[PDB]
Symmetry: C4
Subunit: 512 residues, 4 copies
Amino acid sequence: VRIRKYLANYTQDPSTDNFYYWTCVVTVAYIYNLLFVIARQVFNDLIGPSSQSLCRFYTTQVECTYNMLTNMKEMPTYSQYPDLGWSKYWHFRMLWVFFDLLMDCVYLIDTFLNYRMGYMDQGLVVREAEKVTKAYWQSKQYRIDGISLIPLDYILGWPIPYINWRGLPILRLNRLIRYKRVRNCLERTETRSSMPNAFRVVVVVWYIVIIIHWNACLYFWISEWIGLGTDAWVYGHLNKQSLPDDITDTLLRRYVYSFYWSTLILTTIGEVPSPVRNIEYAFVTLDLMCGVLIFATIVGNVGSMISNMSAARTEFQNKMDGIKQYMELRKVSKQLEIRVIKWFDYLWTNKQSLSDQQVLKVLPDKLQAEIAMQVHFETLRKVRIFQDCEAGLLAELVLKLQLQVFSPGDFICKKGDIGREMYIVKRGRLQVVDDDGKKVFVTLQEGSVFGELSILNIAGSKNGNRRTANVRSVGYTDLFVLSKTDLWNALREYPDARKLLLAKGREILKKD
Amino acid sequence: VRIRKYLANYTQDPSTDNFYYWTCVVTVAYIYNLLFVIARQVFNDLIGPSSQSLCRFYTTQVECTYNMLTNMKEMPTYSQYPDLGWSKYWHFRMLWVFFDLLMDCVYLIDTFLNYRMGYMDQGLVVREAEKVTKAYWQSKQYRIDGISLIPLDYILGWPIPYINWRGLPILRLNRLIRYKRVRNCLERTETRSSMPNAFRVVVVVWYIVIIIHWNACLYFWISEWIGLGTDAWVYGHLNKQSLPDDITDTLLRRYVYSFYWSTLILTTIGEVPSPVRNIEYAFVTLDLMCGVLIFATIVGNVGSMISNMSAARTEFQNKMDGIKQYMELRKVSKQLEIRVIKWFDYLWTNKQSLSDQQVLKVLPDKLQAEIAMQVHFETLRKVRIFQDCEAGLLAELVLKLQLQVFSPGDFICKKGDIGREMYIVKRGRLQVVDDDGKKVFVTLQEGSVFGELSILNIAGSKNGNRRTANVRSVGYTDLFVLSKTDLWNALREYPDARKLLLAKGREILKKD
Amino acid sequence: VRIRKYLANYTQDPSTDNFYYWTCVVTVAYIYNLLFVIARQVFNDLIGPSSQSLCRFYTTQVECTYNMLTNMKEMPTYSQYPDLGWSKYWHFRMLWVFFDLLMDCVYLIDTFLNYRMGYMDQGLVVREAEKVTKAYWQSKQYRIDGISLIPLDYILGWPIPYINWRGLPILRLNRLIRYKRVRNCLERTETRSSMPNAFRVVVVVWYIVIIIHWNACLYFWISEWIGLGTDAWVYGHLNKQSLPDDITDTLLRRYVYSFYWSTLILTTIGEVPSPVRNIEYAFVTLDLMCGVLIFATIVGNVGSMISNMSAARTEFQNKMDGIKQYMELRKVSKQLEIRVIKWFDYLWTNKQSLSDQQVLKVLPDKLQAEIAMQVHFETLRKVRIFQDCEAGLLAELVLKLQLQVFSPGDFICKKGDIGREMYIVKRGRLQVVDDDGKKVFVTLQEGSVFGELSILNIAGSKNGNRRTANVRSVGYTDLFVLSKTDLWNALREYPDARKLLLAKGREILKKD
Amino acid sequence: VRIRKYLANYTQDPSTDNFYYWTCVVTVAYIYNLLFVIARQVFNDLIGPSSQSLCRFYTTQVECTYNMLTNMKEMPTYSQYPDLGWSKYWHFRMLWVFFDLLMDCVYLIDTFLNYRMGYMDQGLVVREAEKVTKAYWQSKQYRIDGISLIPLDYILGWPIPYINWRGLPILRLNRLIRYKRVRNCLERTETRSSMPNAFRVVVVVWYIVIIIHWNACLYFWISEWIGLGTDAWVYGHLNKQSLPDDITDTLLRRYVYSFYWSTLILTTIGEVPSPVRNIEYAFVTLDLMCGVLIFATIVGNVGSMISNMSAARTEFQNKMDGIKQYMELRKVSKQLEIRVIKWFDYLWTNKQSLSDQQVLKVLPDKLQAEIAMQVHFETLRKVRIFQDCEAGLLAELVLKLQLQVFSPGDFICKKGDIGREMYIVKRGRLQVVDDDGKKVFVTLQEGSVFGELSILNIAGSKNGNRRTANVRSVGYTDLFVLSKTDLWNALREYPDARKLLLAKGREILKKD
């Protein structure tokens, strides 16, 4: 009663996390097919030899031991089993059948979830069973789902002794049409990964191994079709690189040498025997060319994926080289040169180089505002004008605060310079020093606001546009820099902050 | 009567589609020449052996069977036919002559179309016979047309028995001067292709095969000039890679081994016998160097052509990595981090990432306006101000509408925030919720307009610059964002839309 | 009397063309030294054998014929000549001495020109003998000039029989310090070249050959120091790749095999015998590593130099692919899609794609104005307002004219649209059509001005800001587009053009 | 008394130069470990053979001479020493122990400096012992410091005869965890280097050698584990490339051949014997793949590091090619073309191409102002308005002066053109010529100011906006170009400079 209702009214939401784990499960079944269907077609002892080897021994033909598959002057001749080896290797073949049925159950569950898959209508996922089933039926998706599930390998994919049918494991290649779920899994995996480049490198290493594996099966398929041990390019006793002295011909040897051959050919090292026949020349020429073009792309990418792991450092280093080269040409003094270099060094050890323009550039301004208001929360909690006034002021200004770094001696404001900006202390410590020297009057910590007196337009005192005091950085200071125009936009829109700023500035000026 | 008049007053328009198909036809003739002229010069059994081979047999010289061209301890010595083999291979040579004459008829028709080719005078094609023929005569094009048609290969390009002339198929290389039509065909083919990168890859694969083919003919030409089977670098019985044991020396073998040799040399694999003579050292050194430099360019391009197949994804992935790296450093909360990541995920599954700036950047603004008015036609058909007013409003505004994506919970307008933009719903659904919570008052679907009350300047009510209500996104919303300045430009130019907007806003405000 | 005065008061101007030809002459002497000093040190039979070879013949030692330097079971042993072969090869050695003295005369003339070389003081070249000689003496240039001329190879660089001195041609390597003149020659050659990329490719091909040549001399130097024919890596009879069967050991063979060896090692093909001794392992390891790193840079550049030969086409093709991909996603109609594609096709066949932003970007505005006024001279000669008024108008406006391309049907102005620009016809033909259809009133050719009526502010008629007529492009039109703001700047500065434009517009409007 | 107090209250400042030299010292100890720990594990005769070799001689076993390790038909069998060779090689082992203890003392001093390391609190370094020690204890740094110092190689890393313990030098690999100090040393070294790219190339060459060295030890470890001289891939007498004829098996030979093997495998040259066993196939396949991927990245970088050594020249050359290509298409006259080319040539020989935008872009405006005021100090000392007025004028303007280069004939101001800029002469010489020709009235050297009369707004004379005279460049001139808007900002803020400029202009105009 419960199961019937639940499956009757079930509908899948594609944007969950359980669905992501499910697509990760489907990728495992896809990789299973991708490797082992071609493996079992070409190396057909993966299910069980299905024939005995019958080496000629010295006189008469006997079944081969491992000592007879070593240093052999001839290849063995196979004699089919009466039951195609089902009595001997039914356990191997039932393991294979179990894993095949398991991956096909994965495919069936994926087909059901496709049949009941919610879709986005207006930003919202439609999760009504009738709508999702109709959208499935009119989406031509049942074609891909059905072609990928035709159980044609259960009939003709296994050795049937009565018909003397040898099996065609390649009939299971129709499972490889569900590549879209696998492609979506990898994209969502790298979109969710905290180590995106490491995942990309792992995925490309998987691509390389799958390519070399399919090419190994290609090489051994062609070797077996031409005939093993017939010339010195084909795997066999005449190759002498595949079967040296004291090396036994086994199923592991056939795959190991084929994987090695494909590695050397696809990387265009080519330290493998040369073709003997026209068909082998055609195969090897086409294969080397694929290897050149194809591993070009791939290996080129891998080096570029391992570039971008360090590209912020490279941009920093280009700017820094450009500045050093400028300063050495123009013969700038060494004091100023080391000051600039130390500024860059500090700006690097604290990772403030350029890591705001990305968020600024691509995100929507409300997301940028929320991120910035969260990152600088403890700093902007101390700011007085922000703490007790309208909050729209805080938001509108928070998007318009530039962060600048000053050196241990720099003067942020000099007593008669010009008033264009106001500053909020993000880090560091400053001093309002007496004119020309010591006698520090007050000290400014994080959260302090200074510089408004000039860019406000109080009618009270004479200077009007000039700095009223000197402000000297004690160590390295990080300051928010708010322009005069931005301040006045946000003030003409918010009267209470204007009144507070003007009153405090008026008091400071009256006290002189 | 009809044919004479038609050809008398015919003139070609180069910008048709039939002319594009014609240039595609000319490319086929060009490729025919490109491959088979050098093929027939170097491998001169393509027209027929023209001499018998005369292997020494055991004693006396007899004509070679295929069993005598296998495992040979010496190369055969050729004895010319009395009639240069015309009696035996007249059918092969007449097939070759037919295809030569067919491609030369293609060249003649192309020359006529060049003679009668219209040209652009003032954006218009001139299709007066007198003008086009004069422009042809004064364009030095008859030089290229004539040099490429000198029928010098019909006299001296075939075996003439009486003169004991062996033939010079290389005299047909003057046909290879019409490369400009072929270059224009490929450029127009990739400009018309819906799969531009696939076509580029196919064209480069053709370039590679033609280069390896010409180098194969070069290698066999040099081998034959030096003398076949004279050392172990030259094709012959001493090479032992060209002619292994049980391999017959045939015309197919000579081309297969030469193509393989050129593949290994031009890709700098070099698993071929080493030069024996100074001339062979010079040839192989020059050839490997050409191979290194030349396949550098080419193979480098192919990897770069297969890069750009996925470059939007790469830009997206760079932005996304930069943002993730920023947020992990600054220790932004995980809720906001997954909100940002889900925003990016949605923005990718719908391909809105950056695919408007291209059309915006390169096209003329009238074309951009027409494309945009067509793409968003069903959306902008619902917009009321656009549906019933002057159409110039729709155009002028349609170029100034930015599209922004909001998340399932975001507030587009909060009751006291600031009015700077107005929004038109492209997708999604919104709600005008009561202050702080539920009690949704109205729902906004695609085509709805909201946000104007603030950026209009109605004198009626108090807020003036503030939002009058809260608008919350239900799911993911795509909104057109029209600034206040753009709205007011288009309104000060169009009075009826201004009156409509002001009247509707006045009613909404009076109802409060 | 004449020569003494002339050389007394002579001073060189470095920016002439004769001086450029002179630096080209100096480059020839530099390349002479670069190749042949190391060639003569390592392959010391370039001046004459200087010893006889003394092969053992069958019994006793006799001088080697060429038939005794072939298939040799041992290397010959050299016995020095009494006079070090001066009697036999004085003609070879006097040819070498003549070319050495000629290149040293080139160096002396270059030293004199350096001693009397004018320099820039204030944009002007100082050509007073006293000043240039003083600047030379205080410039530390006499050091480079003298070190590069020490005639130490005339004493100890040749075989002196009496001292039994064998010669040290390597003492002429001090000539290779004058590389600055050679580097300046190549930079000025590519700055003056009309085929810059072809010259760069030629220069890099020269770099490659010089590197392989020096490495060949390195290999043979090490082979001779270790001892020739001592192992199977060193050039000699045991190598069997350097001296195969029927190959004679000659001076040409020693250089041919060494150049081939260096080609294979520096390109990391490595199809050469493997090292036998620890010193040879060290040499070959260091050499392959240099080859990998060094030919990386070089071959990488060559592919990049052959990229930029086609980079405008690549940028065009990226824009065009981006637009096609946008339009296929958004399902834009096929009519508009082919219109956009044909627009791009035309814009390519006429090379108007982006080839103005370079000149705009890097040049000074007066140079840009002069170039533009020359390029569009025949077009702007027809423009009436430009032909008869102040010329400052023409200049100031000519820098502010954007060129736009319209399609065969496009409407440039529609009767009620908005007036923001004015147009000047660069190419093509337009029509002032009746509203909605035919009845063309007037036709506009190159040089015609239209569109001002709207952006002028005549008080006469009602429209004021609207187009008074429709203007339809007949074929493809190229138009200068002058904004309204630029027009009014240049008009408020120039009253006569303002009066002319206003009067003509007033007449047109009054005639309606 | 002194030492105890000094070490009691000592605290380290990380930003000194002595600390940088200390991190350079620590890098030497790190490289010591990196090379020689694995070297001593794999090639265990680095401390002393510890067993005799016992070659079979002809009959009976005797200790091997060097003549018995040459051309050997079998490998020697080792018989352990009673005291593990401590009596023979105690001097070698005490040298090794001394260097181990020295590097461990370096590690201990580094651990003490970490324990007493100052940190930045607010731009300032905290140098109170209590605070720095607490911050150390709560920073999990003692974990890295302790794991890297576990003296487990002093007990079990050396041959102990009594226990018959052979030694495990690999137990010293825990020292390789202090890679952070080494990474910081290299980054600070390239940030302080005046030759940044040379240092990067040296660092990458070190990376390559360390990788090949570790892979050599890997190869010999696997060869020894499999068994030396057992097949033809393993180092030994059957390899015949490792031990040719007349080559003695020594410790130097084992490392030389292994380094060569790793060079050929990691650079995918592969001219080494092919694997014989499945384990060797697996090793070589994994190794070639690492070599392909890994040397991809590395060698790709090296070519890119040697690119950027010349990237300013490449940008210059791209601009110059673009302009030449534009001018050849549009058929600009040859006089103007050579004028443009000579302008570019001069702009290159003086390195003014684009080398200001870097400093402008990345630095803070106060640093830019200080650099610019220092670079142009001697030029701006001559400027009159700057020399005697408020200094804020000099600063505010100095950031807003663009530098432009004019040709030997160019007219900077023509008598009736328009006044928008003012100029200050940086280099070169100009003339105020009479209208149309000669009669030069005055000459302007470096420091002269001209062009203000037009952009000032004196009411005195008629022209108002026009140039009052012609100014012609004599040779190449470099001028500071100050816009009119910038001049008037800085003048409305500074009254005395305004009065001076207006008075001088008034006098000049009154004198006419």
